[PDB]
C-alpha cells in the first residue's frame, strides 16, 4: 500500500503508492519482475539521486496529489536555487 523510495545515500522516503505512482518512471520501475508484491515494501532503489533531490520529489508528489485541480491558483513550490539543476534531471529520470 506504501512504496519505499530510497535515495543513493540510503535515506528512505516512504510515501503512499499512488502518490509516487503519479510519476511515470516510478510506475515503470514498480511494474515487471521488480514488483515483489509482498504488499508492504514495493521498494525502488535509485542509484544516481541525491537525498535532497528525491526529498523535494516526494514533496512534489504530495503537492500534485493534493492540488491536482482544486481552485485555480496553487501555492508556489519552494525550489531552492542550489537544488535546481539536480531536481530537473531527476524530473527527466522520473518523467514526472
Amino acid at each position: 500500500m506504501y512504496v519505499k523510495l530510497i535515495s543513493s545515500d540510503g535515506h528512505e522516503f516512504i510515501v503512499k503508492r499512488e502518490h509516487a505512482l503519479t510519476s511515470g518512471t516510478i510506475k515503470a520501475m514498480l511494474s515487471g519482475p521488480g514488483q515483489f508484491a509482498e504488499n508492504e515494501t514495493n521498494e525502488v532503489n535509485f542509484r544516481e539521486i541525491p537525498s535532497h533531490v528525491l526529498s523535494k520529489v516526494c514533496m512534489y508528489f504530495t503537492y500534485k496529489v493534493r492540488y491536482t485541480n482544486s481552485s485555480t491558483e496553487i501555492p508556489e513550490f519552494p525550489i531552492a536555487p542550489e537544488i535546481a539543476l539536480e531536481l530537473l534531471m531527476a524530473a527527466n529520470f522520473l518523467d514526472c
Binding site: K64, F77, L85, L87, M89, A91, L94
Partner: protein
C-alpha cells in the same frame, strides 16, 4: 547636404531659374555638384531634381543649368509610377516618357544618352515608344541611337508600338527598315502584339511589310491571336494574306466564334452562332476532301456534350443559351489545346456568371476544370482558390450545401499549389521574392478559408478522412509565412487577413472548429514563430474574451489536450500566463495548466540564471530553452 538637396528639389519642380541660382552658388565646388548629382527621396520613391524638371517639362530651369554648369543626364532614376516604380533609368529616360519634346533636345547637346542601357536595357526610345510622340521618336533616332535594342524577353520597339495605340511610331520604324520578324522569348513576332488589341490600322500597316506567319511558343499562329482576342476587324484582315489554306481558315472562324461565346467586354450570342455556323458550313461545303470535325473525348465538366459534327445540331441549339456557351468552350479547347494562357478565362467567366445566376454545381464543375487546366500550366491559381472559397461562403450564407468531393478536389489542388509556391520561394534568390511570398501567404490563407468552410459543411466520412489526409500532407509540408507563423498560428491569431468578399461572412479567426481539425490532423502544437510564440501563446492575446467565450474556451481545451506547453517562453521570456493580456483568458489557462515537476524545476533554473549549459542531458538543453 540632404536638406540642401530638398531645397533645390523644389526650385526645379517649380520651374524657376532665379531661385536655383542662389541655391547653387556662393559655395565650394564639392557641395554644389552634389545637389545636381543625387536623387531626392520624396513620396517613398527617389527622383533626381532634374527628373522632376523633365517630368513636368520645365525646360526653362533645366536649359540654363546645362549652359552654366556641367550637369549630366546619366543620373539613375525610376521609370514611371504606373505600377512599375523600378530604378535604373537615366534622366533622359523620363525626358521622352513625360511627353515633352522641349526637354529632349536640350539634353542631347550636353552629353547625349540616347544609347542608355539600364538593367532592362531600356533606351530612351523605348520610353518614347511608350509615350508615342512622333517628334521625340524622330529626333532621338536622328541623334545616332540604335533601334534594335531588345530586353530579356526581346522587347523590340516595334512590338510596343504595335501593342500601344500610337500607330505613328510603328509606321516610322518601317521607313528605317526595321526587323519585321523580331523573335521574342515566347515567339511573339510583331503580328502577335499588333493583332491582339484590335488595332486595325497597325495590323494593316504591316501587311505591306510582310510580317508573315510564325507559330509562337504557346502554339498559336498570329491569325489565331486575333481570333482569340474577340477582334473580328483584324480576323478578316489576316484572312486575306493569300497564304492561309483550308485548315487554318475555318479554325480561325471557329476560334473567333469560341472566343465570342464567353467574354466580359464582347459577349454576343447571335454573332457566336453565326460565326460558328459560317465555319460549320465552310467545313461541310463540298463533300469532297471535306474538312470533317474531329471530336474531343467527352468531358463531365461540360455536361455530356460531344461537340457539333453537323450543321443541323448546331442550329437546334441556337435558341438555348447555355448550350452555345458550353459548345464554344469545347471547340476552344480543340483549337488552343490545354496550354494557352487564356484558355480557361472563358470558363472562369462562365463560372462567375453561373454563380451570379445562382447555378452552383455547374459553376463548381467548370471552375474545377479551369483550375485543373491552369494547374497543368504551372500557374498561380491562388485567385482561383480564392474564387472557390468565395463561392463556397456564398453558398454557406444562403445555406446551400457544398458537395464534399468538390471541396476535397479544391483542397488537394490548393495543397499542390502550396507545394509549387514553396518551390518558387525556394529557388528564387532575389528576383521576385516579395511577389512569391505574397502569393504563398495568399495561398495559405485561401487554404485556411477552404478548411473553415469544410469544417462548417457536412461531408462524407470517407471523404472527411480524405480531407484529413490532405491537411495531414500539408502539415507535413510545414507551411511557414514571413513571421514564421505556422498553419496553426494563422488559425489562432485574429490578425489573420480575411478577404472582403463572402469569405468574411464565414471565416471568424480564431476559429474553434479549425484548430480542432488541425490538431486532429497532427499540426505541431508547439510550433514557434520568429518570436517563439506557440499556438496557445497567441490565443491568450485574444482581445475578445467574453464576446466569443465559447470560441476561446474550445480552442484552449483543444490546444492543451493536444499537448501544448503552457510555459513556453517567447524570445522576450514571457509565458502564456504572462502574455495573457486579458483577465478572462488568464483564468481558463490556469484551469488547464497540468502540473509538472519538470516545468517547475526548469522555471527555477531559468529564473535563477544557473549555468545549465552542458551540465544536463542534451535533450534537456532544448527543454530549458522552452521554460
Amino acid at each position: 547636404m540632404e536638406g540642401l538637396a530638398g531645397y533645390v528639389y523644389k526650385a526645379a519642380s517649380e520651374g524657376k531659374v532665379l531661385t536655383l541660382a542662389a541655391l547653387l552658388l556662393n559655395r565650394s565646388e564639392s557641395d554644389i555638384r552634389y545637389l545636381l548629382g543625387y536623387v531626392s527621396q520624396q513620396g517613398g520613391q527617389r527622383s533626381t531634381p532634374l527628373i522632376i524638371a523633365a517630368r513636368n517639362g520645365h525646360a526653362k530651369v533645366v536649359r540654363l543649368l546645362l549652359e552654366h554648369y556641367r550637369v549630366q543626364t546619366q543620373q539613375t532614376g525610376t521609370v514611371r509610377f504606373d505600377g512599375y516604380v523600378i530604378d535604373g533609368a537615366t534622366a533622359l529616360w523620363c525626358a521622352a516618357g513625360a511627353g515633352h519634346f522641349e526637354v529632349v533636345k536640350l539634353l542631347v547637346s550636353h552629353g547625349a544618352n540616347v544609347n542608355h542601357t539600364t538593367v532592362t536595357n531600356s533606351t530612351p526610345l523605348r520610353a518614347a515608344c511608350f509615350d508615342g510622340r512622333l517628334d521625340i521618336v524622330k529626333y532621338l533616332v536622328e541623334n545616332n541611337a540604335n533601334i534594335s535594342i531588345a530586353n530579356k524577353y526581346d522587347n523590340t520597339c516595334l512590338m510596343i508600338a504595335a501593342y500601344k495605340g500610337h500607330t505613328d511610331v510603328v509606321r516610322y520604324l518601317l521607313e528605317q527598315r526595321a526587323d519585321p520578324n523580331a523573335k521574342a522569348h515566347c515567339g511573339a513576332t510583331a503580328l502577335h502584339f499588333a493583332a491582339e488589341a484590335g488595332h486595325i490600322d497597325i495590323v494593316k500597316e504591316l501587311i505591306k511589310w510582310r510580317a508573315a506567319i510564325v507559330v509562337n511558343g504557346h502554339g498559336m499562329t498570329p491569325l489565331k491571336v486575333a481570333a482569340e482576342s474577340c477582334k473580328a476587324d483584324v480576323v478578316e484582315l489576316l484572312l486575306s494574306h493569300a497564304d492561309c489554306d483550308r485548315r487554318s481558315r475555318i479554325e480561325a472562324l471557329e476560334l473567333l466564334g469560341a472566343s465570342f461565346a464567353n467574354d466580359r467586354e464582347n459577349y454576343d450570342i447571335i454573332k457566336t452562332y453565326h460565326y460558328l455556323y459560317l465555319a460549320m458550313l465552310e467545313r461541310f461545303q463540298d463533300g469532297d476532301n471535306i474538312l470533317e470535325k474531329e471530336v474531343l473525348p467527352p468531358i463531365h465538366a461540360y455536361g455530356n456534350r460531344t461537340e457539333c459534327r453537323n450543321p443541323q445540331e448546331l442550329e437546334s441549339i441556337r435558341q438555348d443559351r447555355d448550350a452555345l456557351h458550353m459548345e464554344g468552350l469545347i471547340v476552344r479547347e480543340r483549337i488552343l489545346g490545354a496550354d494557352n494562357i487564356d484558355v480557361s478565362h472563358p470558363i472562369i467567366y462562365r463560372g462567375a456568371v453561373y454563380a451570379d445566376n445562382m447555378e452552383f454545381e455547374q459553376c463548381i464543375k467548370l471552375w474545377l476544370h479551369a483550375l485543373h487546366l491552369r494547374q497543368k500550366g504551372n500557374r498561380n491559381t491562388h485567385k482561383d482558390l480564392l474564387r472557390f472559397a468565395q463561392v463556397f461562403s456564398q453558398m454557406i450564407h444562403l445555406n446551400e450545401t457544398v458537395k464534399a468531393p468538390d471541396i476535397e478536389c479544391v483542397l488537394r489542388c490548393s495543397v499542390l499549389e502550396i507545394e509549387q509556391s514553396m518551390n518558387r520561394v525556394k529557388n528564387i534568390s532575389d528576383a521576385d521574392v516579395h511577389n512569391a511570398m505574397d502569393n504563398y501567404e495568399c495561398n495559405l490563407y485561401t487554404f485556411l478559408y477552404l478548411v473553415c468552410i469544410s469544417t462548417k459543411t457536412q461531408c462524407s466520412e470517407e471523404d472527411q478522412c480524405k480531407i484529413n489526409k490532405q491537411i495531414y500532407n500539408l502539415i507535413h509540408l510545414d507551411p511557414r509565412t514571413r513571421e514564421g507563423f505556422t498553419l496553426l498560428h494563422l488559425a489562432v491569431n485574429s490578425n489573420t487577413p480575411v478577404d472582403d468578399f463572402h469569405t468574411n461572412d464565414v471565416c471568424s479567426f480564431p476559429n474553434a472548429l479549425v484548430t480542432k481539425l488541425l490538431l486532429d490532423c497532427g499540426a505541431e502544437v508547439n510550433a514557434v514563430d520568429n518570436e517563439g510564440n506557440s499556438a496557445l501563446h497567441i490565443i491568450v492575446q485574444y482581445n475578445r474574451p467574453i464576446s466569443d467565450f465559447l470560441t476561446l474556451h474550445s480552442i484552449i481545451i483543444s490546444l492543451v489536450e493536444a499537448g501544448a506547453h503552457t510555459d513556453m517562453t517567447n524570445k522576450q521570456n514571457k509565458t502564456p500566463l504572462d502574455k495573457s493580456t486579458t483577465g478572462v483568458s488568464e483564468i481558463l489557462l490556469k484551469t488547464q495548466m497540468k502540473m509538472s515537476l519538470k516545468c517547475l524545476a526548469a522555471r527555477a533554473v531559468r529564473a535563477n540564471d544557473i549555468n545549465y549549459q552542458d551540465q544536463i542531458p542534451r535533450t534537456l538543453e532544448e527543454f530549458v530553452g522552452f521554460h
